Amino acid sequence: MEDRAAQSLLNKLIRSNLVDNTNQVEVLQRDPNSPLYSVKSFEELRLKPQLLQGVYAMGFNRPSKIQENALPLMLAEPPQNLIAQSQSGTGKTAAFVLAMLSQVEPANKYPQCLCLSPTYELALQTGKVIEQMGKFYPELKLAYAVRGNKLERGQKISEQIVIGTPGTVLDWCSKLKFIDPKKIKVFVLDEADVMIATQGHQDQSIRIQRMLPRNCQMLLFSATFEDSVWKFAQKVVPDPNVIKLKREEETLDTIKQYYVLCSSRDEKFQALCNLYGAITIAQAMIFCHTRKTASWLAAELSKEGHQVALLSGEMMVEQRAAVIERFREGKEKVLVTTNVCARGIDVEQVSVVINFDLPVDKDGNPDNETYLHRIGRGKRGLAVNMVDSKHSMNILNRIQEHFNKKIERLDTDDLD
Ligand SMILES: Nc1ncnc2c1ncn2[C@@H]1O[C@H](COP(=O)(O)OP(=O)(O)O)[C@@H](O)[C@H]1O
């Protein structure tokens, strides 16, 4: 099961800047003999003038934690292959786009750089960065090799850069002969953790990678390294330098955890209204299990005079992005959401979490990951868990068992 694409898109639509990470980058140089090399500025990388111009113009002062290690590896001569894993928002897309723009020679009117995205909508996000960093390349044009593109059989395309989805790209490189694969200098496999979702996407990617010149630079980027992601990368990127950055560790040290005992949904709703009655609820998210519950809760709250924003799956991703952004600006004080709609999403400016229903997995057990990632976000936070059965009480006790910190009982009416 992979809702992966949607989540990856939403995270991009709302991302405004680099996520802060304090762990150190792990580099496994292809040759264990050769030393490690890092940079601390773009100038140190002797970039093509107009490319450097584009980099500053889009607001980048210096390379990010991950770029410090990737850029030099990618700009090495002769071109080395790279597998880079790091959580989203750490500068992976800016990196390989910089890589592509370095190798691309606008003089030559054929595809020189090829990037595979898992979906057209994600392709457009990469496409956005390219148009922006390479805005001082006059003759640089972009092509989308996607199922939607209605290109009629004919001559080869003249765009120096192609982005697209495995299925369409393979055809363009073979059957429909829109691209000469042997002329590709740089091949990027983006969002590997998302592309493994379809068995089809894997096989197609591999079969494309095999048509490339053997000295083509292969770059594969990924947020996570599940065993499946790893064994796939090994099949796509031969002789790889490997960059790994450990995901930031969420911390419940600065957070107050409560739970309220209830007997029905109607009581959970009253506990919550009481909570509004006591403290001013703002910058808060309320998590429900089903879309049915979320829309009901939001309707009931509105009726009680509380304005809330709903975040459920019937909304297009762009709509969820607009809501989330209003929530960040403080235009919205409270966000009601289903679990799935918020899973993995890096919503910012959240001081208060209300688990209207407790987070569980497909089976029925405590979803410790999701809990920690919600609550964790030395800044003070509030977390309130609504328990409404002996069963959901068990879940809470098992959550309080996993972590070794107590969830203090909170009496509905007594909230001093
Ligand atoms: N060197 C840099 N300096 C400042 N900001 C950057 C730099 N590289 C990327 N960013 C910004 O950080 C955010 C994450 O970049 P991105 O490459 O999209 O992350 P990823 O591809 O790893 O998900 C984006 O908003 C991007 O504009």
From Swiss-Prot:
Gene3D superfamilies: 6.10.250.2170, P-loop containing nucleotide triphosphate hydrolases (3.40.50.300)
Protein encoded by which gene: DDX19B
Motif (Q motif): 40-68
Consequence of changing E191Q: Loss of activity
Domain notes: The N-terminal extension helix acts as an autoinhibitory domain, preventing ATP hydrolysis, unless the N-terminus of the protein is displaced by RNA binding, allowing cleft closure to bring key side chains into position for catalysis.
Chief place where the protein resides: cytoplasm
Catalysis performed (reactions): ATP + H2O = ADP + phosphate + H(+)
Matching PROSITE patterns: HELICASE_ATP_BIND_1, HELICASE_CTER, Q_MOTIF
Record's keyword annotation contains Acetylation: yes
Cross-referenced InterPro entries: DEAD/DEAH_box_helicase_dom, Helicase_ATP-bd, Helicase_C-like, P-loop_NTPase, RNA_helicase_DEAD_Q_motif
Keyword ATP-binding found: yes
Role of this protein: ATP-dependent RNA helicase involved in mRNA export from the nucleus. Rather than unwinding RNA duplexes, DDX19B functions as a remodeler of ribonucleoprotein particles, whereby proteins bound to nuclear mRNA are dissociated and replaced by cytoplasmic mRNA binding proteins.
Lineage summary: Eukaryota, Metazoa, Chordata, Craniata, Vertebrata
Domain Helicase C-terminal: 254-416
Compartments where found: Cytoplasm; Nucleus, Nucleoplasm
Species the sequence originates in: Homo sapiens (Human)
Record protein name field: ATP-dependent RNA helicase DDX19B
Region named C-terminal lobe: 249-416
